[PDB]
């Protein structure tokens, strides 16, 4: 399966209300704490729907934000980034730095992501997971009916 799913009720962590959640990429899953101080979960989901639409439509990429604050007061956000190649989808976990941006806006998130790499300039492996296109479609469709 692919997607990002709520667990239980929102709880206070690191001084703010978060939504305990998981991201699942086939056999991989990882716990997340989505901050709610600016976006509720409906907002997160709407953003993922739009981002998935753009990426799926031209088979480039879809950045799924898993944290968001007031864009002018934001230093960085965590994202999970989907890269489409045929029926395979690579997924990376990237922090987008915006401390010296001010220009940033969430609906433009896919512009802040560049093409895919597997190792950095130092030779370090970029963390990466994979799942099939169909499983991303299903997640895209489910958001589209919510």
């Amino acid at each position: 399966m692919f997607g990002i799913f709520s667990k239980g009720e929102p709880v206070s962590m690191e001084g703010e209300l978060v939504q305990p959640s998981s991201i699942v990429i086939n056999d991989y899953e990882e716990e997340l704490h989505l901050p709610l101080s600016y976006w509720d979960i409906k907002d997160y989901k709407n953003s993922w729907l739009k981002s998935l639409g753009e990426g799926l439509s031209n088979k480039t990429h879809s950045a799924l934000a898993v944290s968001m604050y007031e864009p002018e007061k934001t230093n960085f956000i965590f994202t999970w980034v989907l890269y489409f190649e045929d029926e395979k989808v690579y997924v990376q976990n990237n922090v987008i730095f915006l401390e010296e941006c001010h220009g940033f806006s969430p609906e433009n998130i896919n512009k802040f992501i560049e093409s895919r790499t597997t190792h950095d300039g130092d030779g370090m492996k970029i963390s990466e997971w994979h799942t099939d296109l169909n499983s991303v479609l299903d997640f895209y469709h489910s958001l589209n009916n919510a």
């Binding site: 690191e14 703010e16 944290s67 956000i77 990237n94 987008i96 790499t117 950095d120 970029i126 990466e128």
Partner: protein, 76 residues
């Protein structure tokens, strides 16, 4: 996984600069990132967790691994 001990934990690793997710004056709020002057770490909050590990991101914010308490790479 630590809250306030995390800063000192990260500082002892060289990552002196706590970068909070929000600019002043909302900087005591949220999952922060700790800066090496080169790389960034945040406490591994994951389910497996083990014992107080780290996720690391490179100078461009690309994830370059899950790490143990002494920054030995464990896995992606």
């Amino acid at each position: 996984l630590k809250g306030k001990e995390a800063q000192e934990a990260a500082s002892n690793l060289g990552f002196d600069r706590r970068i909070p997710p929000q600019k002043a004056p909302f900087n005591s709020h949220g999952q922060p990132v700790f800066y090496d002057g080169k790389n960034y770490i945040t406490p591994d909050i994951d389910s497996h967790n083990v014992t107080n590990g780290w996720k690391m991101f490179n100078s461009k914010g690309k994830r370059i691994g899950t790490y143990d308490s002494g920054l030995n790479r464990i896995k992606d």
